[PDB]
Assembly symmetry: C2
Homo-oligomer: 212 residues x 2
């Protein structure tokens, strides 16, 4: 529905050892980045600057990584998704048992299962993220989405919660989303990577609309 959709997830996962054994981004290197939110960080589709769907409501550098909570607010984008979801068999199959069907959230969960902070500038919703653990979790309530991630601390969530609170931007079209999906269809290890990110961030231990 044109009620907004929230999306949360890790943009980057932090190296936990004292010697870079994992080759992940150091927490203080990324925190320098953060330190370096007054200007709105746009949320776009697959890095396309004409395809702004909403914005990042909060970014919190936590123990395991840099978590992000964005808001998909664009009526046009949500309408396109509403229209495409009505023609998807995957969506008609429905979520996992206890969850209430939600065609848009479910369409988004399958189409843009990844998050990507990169060429801050913007956060991109894409079919998969390159960095480890960048799975995108959508839901209607921001509280439910943060609760999908076991890594998050009561304090971490309060850290985010404080930020998110204290003319349609989408200038693209369905064709742009159509072209993206075909490219996505040829990304080779997409599902595997998704499944790996899900486990890593622990959404496998929670009920969600994640299609992977």
């Amino acid at each position: 529905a044109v009620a907004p959709v929230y999306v949360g997830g890790f943009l980057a996962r932090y190296d936990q050892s004292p010697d870079e054994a994992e080759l992940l981004l150091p927490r203080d290197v990324v925190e320098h980045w953060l330190h370096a939110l007054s200007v709105a960080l746009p949320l776009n589709i697959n890095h396309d600057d004409t395809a702004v769907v909403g914005h990042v409501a909060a970014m919190q550098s936590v123990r395991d990584g840099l978590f992000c909570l964005g808001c998909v607010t664009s009526p046009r984008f949500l309408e396109i998704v509403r229209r495409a979801s009505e023609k998807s068999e995957l969506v008609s199959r429905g979520p996992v048992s206890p969850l209430q069907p939600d065609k848009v959230v479910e369409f988004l969960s399958g189409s843009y299962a990844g998050l990507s902070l990169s060429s801050f500038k913007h956060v991109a919703l894409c079919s998969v993220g390159r960095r480890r653990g960048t799975l995108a979790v959508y839901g209607r309530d921001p509280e439910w989405v943060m609760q999908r991630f076991p890594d998050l601390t009561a304090a971490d969530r309060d850290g985010l919660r404080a930020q998110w609170q204290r003319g349609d931007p989408f200038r693209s079209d369905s064709y742009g989303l159509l072209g993206n999906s075909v490219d996505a269809m040829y990304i080779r290890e997409r599902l595997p990577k998704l499944r790996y990110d899900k486990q890593l961030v622990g959404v496998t231990e929670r009920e969600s609309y994640v299609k992977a």
Copy 2:
């Protein structure tokens, strides 16, 4: 440009793939035309099958995507694709529409008067069902080593001798996401390519 018809040919069934029997397809057919649609959606007819020839290895088909509306949607979608922008293999000329069609509807699917239509899908359920697109019928037919000169004259005799697409981009978009979650999609398509020897040819196939 794009709104020039695109031909599509491939096997709808392979008689060696472990059910369409050699004997039956041969007599209703081998011894007015089925519409060609997108993923079995009857409101998504993009053209029609022009010829079907029962041959040594399977049931070969040749269809033509004619809908100016469908082709228009595809041309506009094709320029927003990074895969299409990467172009085909060297000698071949960039054909954004043909390449887009190759990417998204890499498979053919015969629905089974004994069949309702032939469907262009992300992958067909029957193996060996790769969809080979191209601007010239002779060129696509020639993509398949299996086909004999005799078979070709057989198919050829079948062509020589209102916009039906009532769907839209939004529909194609719903389709693409379903395709994204079909698990061994690429593997199946790669197997399909080897099976019909399309690997032994240059083509717009993206798998």
